[PDB]
Design a protein around this ligand. Structure first.
Ligand SMILES: Nc1ncnc2c1ncn2[C@@H]1O[C@H](COP(=O)(O)OP(=O)(O)O)[C@@H](O)[C@H]1O
Ligand SMILES: [Mg+2]
Length: 302
């Protein structure tokens, strides 16, 4: 159903340089926020990613995919639907986790690599796979096609959906979309995997469809006044919160239509779908408030 994880990023350069204190500790799957009384939260996984040298507990990109990606991918081969959301403060590690860098590929490249490896393994004259990708951006409840404002009618009228046949292919679209792309919008990478089995006369005898929606959410931080985007983002994120919580609690009412994001992903949120959320947070004292907020959001969803 619903899996919730928290990933703790390293100190950034500024925090390192300026000796900002660490206020986040971890204990197995508990997160302890020390005051800048200690607060303790429990999750399905906690990824402590502060320092590669501490092998005893460091979680690299490979670890995140093993614990959150592999299962979600398998789910799509099973013919079911799934979403993965990265949620948290700007600079906390949402994009690093979802897409990653050229040197540290994240969830999306690993998942696509795994996907094509598996399809190329199982494909033959009697069964085929069709892989289609869309990449869109939701900013202020308006949708933009990152593979080119599209109207919401639940479908996005005129949203490109492109057939890809190799990892390199699907890579050109990751690349293309990321260029055309950010901290104040949601980015949705969608894969449709269709697996068709054929009978003796080359007619269709079996077919499974699995959808994967991999989501880099808009930053969750509160804007500070020094003389609306944040408010619009808050509604969306609050609604996504209510949807995930309600599904996690599973006759209940689920408010899909209260936001463009949750409505467009209704198909992969309801039914027998699987949802995984990674709440990214800074370890540093100067982010306590936003870290605390992110932790409560993640706790609530679980
Ligand atoms: N777990 C991590 N390990 C190493 N570097 C990270 C990690 N998380 C984030 N970073 C780096 O910190 C910066 C902020 O990450 P990013 O994902 O862009 O933040 P966000 O998407 O949440 O705004 C990026 O340069 C990213 O490469
Ligand atoms: Mg980002």
């Amino acid at each position: 159903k619903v899996k919730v994880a928290v990933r703790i990023r390293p100190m950034n350069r500024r925090e390192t340089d300026l000796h900002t204190k660490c206020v986040v500790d971890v204990d197995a799957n508990k997160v302890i926020l020390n005051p800048v009384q200690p607060k303790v939260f429990a999750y399905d996984h906690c990824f402590w990613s502060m320092d590669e040298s501490v092998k005893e507990k460091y979680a690299g990109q490979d670890i995140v995919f093993k614990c959150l990606g592999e299962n979600i991918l398998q789910n799509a081969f099973d013919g079911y639907n799934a979403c993965i959301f990265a949620y948290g403060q700007t600079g906390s590690g949402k994009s690093y986790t979802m897409m990653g860098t050229a040197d540290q590929p994240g969830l999306i490249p690993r998942l696509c690599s795994g996907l094509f490896e598996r399809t190329q393994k199982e494909e033959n004259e009697e069964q085929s796979f069709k892989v289609e990708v869309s990449y869109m951006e939701i900013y202020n409840e308006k949708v933009r096609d990152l593979l080119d404002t599209l109207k919401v009618r639940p479908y996005v009228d005129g949203l490109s959906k492109l057939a890809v046949t190799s990892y390199k292919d699907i890579e050109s679209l990751m690349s293309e979309g990321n260029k055309s792309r950010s901290s104040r919008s949601h980015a949705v990478f969608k894969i449709t995997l269709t697996h068709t089995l054929y009978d003796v006369k080359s007619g269709t005898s079996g077919e499974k469809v699995g959808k994967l929606s991999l989501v880099d959410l808009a930053g969750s931080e509160r804007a500070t006044k020094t003389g609306k985007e944040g408010s619009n983002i808050n509604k969306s994120l609050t609604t996504l919160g209510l949807v995930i919580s309600a599904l996690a609690d599973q006759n209940k009412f689920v408010p899909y239509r209260d936001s463009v994001l949750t409505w467009l992903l209704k198909d992969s949120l309801g039914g027998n779908s699987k949802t995984a959320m990674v709440a990214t947070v800074s370890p540093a004292a100067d982010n306590y408030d936003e870290t605390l907020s992110t932790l409560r959001y993640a706790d609530r969803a679980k």
